[PDB]
Subunit: 204 residues, 3 copies
């Protein structure tokens, strides 16, 4: 029961909702989970939303399963960073002899990898800056600009984005993070979808 987790366009008669995994299976350094989807703004594919991602920098992007990515969302990788121990002018890129001035292995600090958890809801036109992490069950308000990490099951928003409120109580979050319903077999999930929607899955 349900949509095929490996179909680029799960809903025929709607070429806007797309499954991310089947589309990003070809990309290097990008691990994406099943059922996570993207809501296109003008027909573009999610791969066009990943920016400044260069294999030579070795940074990686990780997206969990069952995520909701609104239209216009953008993920910024480490390619945007300029040198900062002196001038920020990229002499090297202009060539004609300036290519001598290319940064050495240790003069381009890296902020780290980008990992988005499971069951995460990202609003419209949100911008993700390099190296940030987002915990499971988090909700990011539309038009946010995230520079710092966001704890699991939190409500964040703004520019810069800040934590606004806890979705549930600690004990509930603790249990939810321990059962990880998203890793269950598809058949088991189907028999509990309701309990997952009302948060009663922590009881049974």
């Amino acid at each position: 029961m349900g949509p095929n987790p490996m179909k680029m366009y799960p809903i025929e008669g709607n070429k806007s909702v797309q499954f991310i995994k089947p589309i990003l299976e070809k990309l290097e350094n990008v691990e994406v989970g099943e059922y996570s989807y993207y809501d296109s703004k003008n027909g573009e594919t999610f791969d066009k939303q990943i920016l400044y991602h260069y294999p030579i920098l070795n940074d990686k992007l990780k997206i969990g399963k069952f995520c909701s990515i609104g239209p216009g969302v953008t993920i910024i990788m480490n390619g945007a960073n300029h040198r900062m121990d002196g001038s920020t002018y990229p002499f090297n890129l202009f060539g004609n002899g300036w290519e001598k001035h290319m940064p050495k292995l240790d003069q381009l600090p890296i902020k780290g990898d980008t990992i988005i958890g499971n069951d995460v809801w990202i609003g419209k036109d949100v911008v993700i800056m390099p190296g940030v992490k987002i915990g499971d069950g988090a909700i990011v308000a539309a038009n946010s600009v995230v520079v710092k990490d966001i704890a699991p099951y939190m409500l964040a928003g703004g520019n810069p984005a800040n934590e606004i409120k806890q979705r549930f109580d600690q004990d509930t979050i603790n249990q939810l993070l321990d059962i990880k319903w998203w890793n269950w077999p598809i058949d088991i999930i189907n028999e509990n979808i309701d309990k997952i929607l009302d948060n009663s899955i922590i009881r049974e």
Copy 2:
């Protein structure tokens, strides 16, 4: 004297300025005042700026008179809200038996109506969140994201948007509020335009 309040494009030689009322008089659940206008960004008509507005949700949009709306301003209605008491995943939307997991209207958050007062100036590319109320004579700095109510005759800006300062003294605001020059017959307004532009109408 003055432009025709019911012409789509009141200014000959300017296919950018539009009177909103004539444009949006066809829409369901949208109530707009006269003389309020929109400055087109690329030729689009203000209707394309109202997002996630569905008749089934019963939320209404109200805009006052004599308002100035900058280019790119968008208004987000309640249609963007996901279910929040559990997982934010929209199972129902994928079909294949999942349609049975469709939420009732009682299980969807309702933030209320969106109400814009009279004589309001909204800056370029401002985003308005659902259920927001903006008082008369208020000013919203460009590029703002409004998530909470804004008092009358207040200058707000930012993301999230916050109140910056009172345009005038309290007694002045109180006087303006119970005068409502915008409700005067057009011929009376014409003979007081200069007095309205300098705040001396409080001296009559």
Copy 3:
């Protein structure tokens, strides 16, 4: 040695990077320095990023040398300001008799000129409001909305943008602002590029 400071498209095989000076050479009230460049978002030329710049107001735009402007950056001049001593409604624009209500020379306060210094890096999609001043060697985070001035060699971001950190210590900044490597003859610069990149040029 290096690229031609007078070539619209300095890099062969990349019609995105463009030199500002040659492109804005036609504009009145716009002065831009050598080597400062723009990274095009969709093939658009930088002149399309300067908004509300009206000769009648006489406000000027000044950009220094050796700057790095990210894609989508827009500069808002004084043509956006509305009258604020009373109603913000621009009666005058609609004509048909209301043209007689046109602000006097002193009924439209002006926030001043917009001056960006030398060696400054402005992030992607950053918006610059009217009258702001940005000192040399300052870094502006992407997606920022700058409403107030930024001091030399400071890091600022947010909406509204705030100064986050001082890149170096006072003595260093003081020394840098005193030598102004950006004003040296191109030949002398070429023999110190590496020294400029690691801030060792202060000890010569």
